[PDB]
Amino acid sequence: PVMADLNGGLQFVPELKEFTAKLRKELVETSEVRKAVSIETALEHKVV
């Protein structure tokens, strides 16, 4: 039997799940903050 590792070194990233959940939050948080801050800056400009 042949065992081929086609895993791109992924196994050497410790605590992978937490690492992927952190990258996801850092991205979703940045998305949702930018959405909210841009919507409020538009509404402020609209009012003034």
Binding site: E40, L43, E44, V47, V48
Partner: protein, 70 residues
């Protein structure tokens, strides 16, 4: 005006200020923001139903000179 945080005892203490200053404008963006995002604290609280107290007759005087004088 002051920005206040609610403490665990429900006392409020000052942690900063609102400080907005604009020239020519069509509106106050501070209050527009706080209306949309915050809730209004109303000191007045309506009863379930108004309680009639009285329907009272009174008269205005024949002359306004006494009130004018005092």
């Amino acid at each position: 005006g002051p920005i206040k945080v609610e403490l665990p005892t429900k006392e409020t203490v000052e942690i900063g200020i609102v400080d907005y200053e604009a020239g020519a404008s069509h509106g106050n963006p501070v209050v527009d923001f706080l209306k949309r995002n915050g809730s209004t604290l109303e000191q007045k609280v309506n009863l379930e139903n108004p309680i009639p107290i009285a329907v009272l007759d009174s008269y205005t005087p024949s002359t306004n000179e006494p009130y004018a004088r005092v």
